[PDB]
Amino acid sequence: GDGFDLNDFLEQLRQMKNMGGXXXXXXXXXXXXXXXXXXXXXXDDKVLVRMEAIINSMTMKERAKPEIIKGSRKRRIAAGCGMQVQDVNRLLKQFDDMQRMMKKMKKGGXXXXXXXXXXXXXXXXXXX
Amino acid sequence: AVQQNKPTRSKRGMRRSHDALTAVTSLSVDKTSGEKHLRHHITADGYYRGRKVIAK
Amino acid sequence: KQSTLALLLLLLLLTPVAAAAAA
Amino acid sequence: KAKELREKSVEELNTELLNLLREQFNLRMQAASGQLQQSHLLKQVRRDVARVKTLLNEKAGA
Amino acid sequence: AAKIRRDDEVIVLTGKDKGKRGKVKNVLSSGKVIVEGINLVKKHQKPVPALNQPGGIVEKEAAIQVSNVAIFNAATGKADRVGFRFEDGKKVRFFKSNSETI
Amino acid sequence: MKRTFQPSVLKRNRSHGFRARMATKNGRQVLARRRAKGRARLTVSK
Amino acid sequence: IREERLLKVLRAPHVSEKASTAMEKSNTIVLKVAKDATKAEIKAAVQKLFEVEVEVVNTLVVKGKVKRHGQRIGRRSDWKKAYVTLKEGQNLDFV
Amino acid sequence: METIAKHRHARSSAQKVRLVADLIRGKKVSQALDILTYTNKKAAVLVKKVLESAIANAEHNDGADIDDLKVTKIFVDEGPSMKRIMPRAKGRADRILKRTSHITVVVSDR
RNA sequence: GCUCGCCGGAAGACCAAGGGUUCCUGUCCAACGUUAAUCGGGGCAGGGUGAGUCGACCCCUAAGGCGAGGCCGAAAGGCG
């Protein structure tokens, strides 16, 4: 009840990779597909298996309390999963985004927050 | 009134001779928690003289 | 109407975060 | 083209011109809905139009 | 009237690649050419998720001034200089030394 | 207090506007001098 | 009117929340049209090209914003917006 | 082994920052960190930042044990200063100098 | 959110003039804001102004202006 953490993130990730709808979620989404590329959707299996396995390299303390993660721990994780530290930093970034988002879902309404979602365009020119 | 001659960096140094701050000497160490803090001021955890008198 | 609405709404919060990572 | 178009009468050219504007319209419709992949098409048609028009003129001109 | 063209095998006169031979990928307007296996640079690429581009140090091929590359004579095994004549009615290239067409 | 510039559009344009210049010999000489110095805008127009 | 002019009127569908709102609730579509076209010609052009029945066309002109790119001050171009009321027996096509 | 951390173009005058910089010169970085914590100044938090950064540098890059570090050289230089304008009475105006400074901290195990 | 305090023939509400996007949302905090700023009339992106009957246009003239011919004036031009 403290808030959103890597435990709930883990649950949502395993439920994700089990229920993964990339082909279906591409259909479920309409306004985002008109702007962003159609084939830009990443494969769920590889990415989410990588994420699950990398999370599995983490102790229970680094999960419930994600802000104690540092470089040496990233080394342990990367060496454990047999991958690059930049990927660990990548997944920590994605987890930061997810945490921020879910925090915004918890603070406001799901309808105000679902309608507050915006598609960023740096100009009216497409892809520029 | 306004000065007659440009005062040298020397004078400017002298005037500032008194402007140095005083580093606080003591950091009191609270008994229970052990964190350092000011004399007579509560800690970062709200500890004072062994109580936790703020829940925060 | 309400079916598809509620259905998609349940998982609605999980999708765009992964979609943003894909984009 | 432009040899190909040159051997057609004025009527068939008016008809082609209208087809072209329908195609062009349809195209920038698709392009403003974000439904276009091949952009190079616009230029293709936008220029062909001119070709046709430039003929109509000289068939009236002389 | 352009001397060095796509797909010519060339030899490199100048630079760290002096003496090396290779095949031309393309030419650029500024008088620069890009040659196979020639003038590798190590470039750092910020990973791009839209293009699924990983990060890392990519070895890439950097343009070389066309004055510095010579058209490679396969007959003589030497670098050559090129010239133009008219055979048939067509404008054609030849090697200056053995005066044979290309 | 009440300063010197109290703006008005209709005033501005009847006084200095393009047509107002073109009305006269002198005005067309202004527009000559400007075109010769190569200004971005000659007159005051919207 | 001539048809040749018509096909040159209608630039693009306008996409936004207001747009969607009217399209759903009041049965109305929103168009970016050539700056010079008029209510007559837009009525004509929709009725012709989408082949559906127009009731009335309301319009407005949008002044483009003013922008800065690399300190430079540019001006986005003007354009014309048209709220196009469909007689109710129609149901939308997007092509 | 000496280690640098710098912060360049900080808003504060060289002068104001010097006051604090001259508080921590020479101490081992623990004691100095605390000196800085309970100093009430702006410069204090600037310099705290730079010092902490400096510790990270030492440990992570050069493999120094934190206990041993002292602050050997800490100096605040002048930065590029920006002109502004404050309008003054009777119409005259004033070119204002918004000053910046270079805080440079250097720590060593020796 | 709660109390406190000020304006109320205004420190409220609506226009014309003048300005020209400052409007509304999201996002950011270098510079700008006489301090911080997570905030803004600041930055970047998006949205936003729907008329037979409200205005302008339009119909009619005031003072005044321009003014075919015309009168006048070295030239330009002045008067009508």
Tab-separated table of N, CA and C in Angstrom, chain C:
chain	number	residue	atom	x	y	z
C	1	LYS	N	-22.161	-2.324	-26.884
C	1	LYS	CA	-21.415	-1.100	-26.613
C	1	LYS	C	-20.633	-1.199	-25.308
C	2	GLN	N	-21.356	-1.349	-24.203
C	2	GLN	CA	-20.756	-1.381	-22.871
C	2	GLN	C	-19.739	-2.510	-22.709
C	3	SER	N	-19.969	-3.616	-23.412
C	3	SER	CA	-19.074	-4.768	-23.364
C	3	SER	C	-17.650	-4.402	-23.773
C	4	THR	N	-17.481	-4.053	-25.046
C	4	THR	CA	-16.177	-3.689	-25.594
C	4	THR	C	-15.556	-2.532	-24.816
C	5	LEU	N	-16.397	-1.575	-24.431
C	5	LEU	CA	-15.966	-0.436	-23.627
C	5	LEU	C	-15.287	-0.885	-22.339
C	6	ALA	N	-16.036	-1.557	-21.469
C	6	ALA	CA	-15.505	-2.031	-20.191
C	6	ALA	C	-14.280	-2.925	-20.379
C	7	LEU	N	-14.392	-3.876	-21.304
C	7	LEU	CA	-13.300	-4.788	-21.632
C	7	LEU	C	-12.002	-4.041	-21.920
C	8	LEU	N	-12.016	-3.214	-22.961
C	8	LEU	CA	-10.836	-2.443	-23.336
C	8	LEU	C	-10.386	-1.497	-22.221
C	9	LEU	N	-11.339	-0.983	-21.449
C	9	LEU	CA	-11.041	-0.048	-20.365
C	9	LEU	C	-10.246	-0.701	-19.240
C	10	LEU	N	-10.516	-1.978	-18.982
C	10	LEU	CA	-9.805	-2.701	-17.930
C	10	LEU	C	-8.299	-2.744	-18.190
C	11	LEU	N	-7.921	-3.111	-19.410
C	11	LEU	CA	-6.514	-3.222	-19.779
C	11	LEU	C	-5.982	-1.951	-20.442
C	12	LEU	N	-6.819	-0.919	-20.500
C	12	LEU	CA	-6.490	0.316	-21.214
C	12	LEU	C	-5.232	1.014	-20.702
C	13	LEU	N	-4.955	0.884	-19.408
C	13	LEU	CA	-3.833	1.594	-18.801
C	13	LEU	C	-2.492	0.895	-19.033
C	14	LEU	N	-2.538	-0.401	-19.325
C	14	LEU	CA	-1.324	-1.190	-19.515
C	14	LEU	C	-0.717	-1.024	-20.908
C	15	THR	N	-1.579	-0.825	-21.899
C	15	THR	CA	-1.171	-0.810	-23.305
C	15	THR	C	-0.253	0.349	-23.742
C	16	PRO	N	-0.643	1.613	-23.474
C	16	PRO	CA	0.093	2.711	-24.116
C	16	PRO	C	1.523	2.887	-23.613
C	17	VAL	N	1.828	2.355	-22.435
C	17	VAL	CA	3.177	2.449	-21.895
C	17	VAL	C	4.115	1.550	-22.691
C	18	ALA	N	3.646	0.345	-22.998
C	18	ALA	CA	4.403	-0.585	-23.826
C	18	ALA	C	4.435	-0.102	-25.271
C	19	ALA	N	3.338	0.517	-25.700
C	19	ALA	CA	3.241	1.061	-27.050
C	19	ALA	C	4.225	2.209	-27.250
C	20	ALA	N	4.453	2.975	-26.189
C	20	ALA	CA	5.390	4.091	-26.233
C	20	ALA	C	6.824	3.578	-26.275
C	21	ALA	N	7.054	2.442	-25.626
C	21	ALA	CA	8.361	1.799	-25.651
C	21	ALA	C	8.608	1.175	-27.019
C	22	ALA	N	7.525	0.786	-27.685
C	22	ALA	CA	7.610	0.228	-29.029
C	22	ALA	C	7.834	1.335	-30.055
C	23	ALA	N	7.162	2.464	-29.853
C	23	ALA	CA	7.286	3.604	-30.753
C	23	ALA	C	8.617	4.320	-30.550
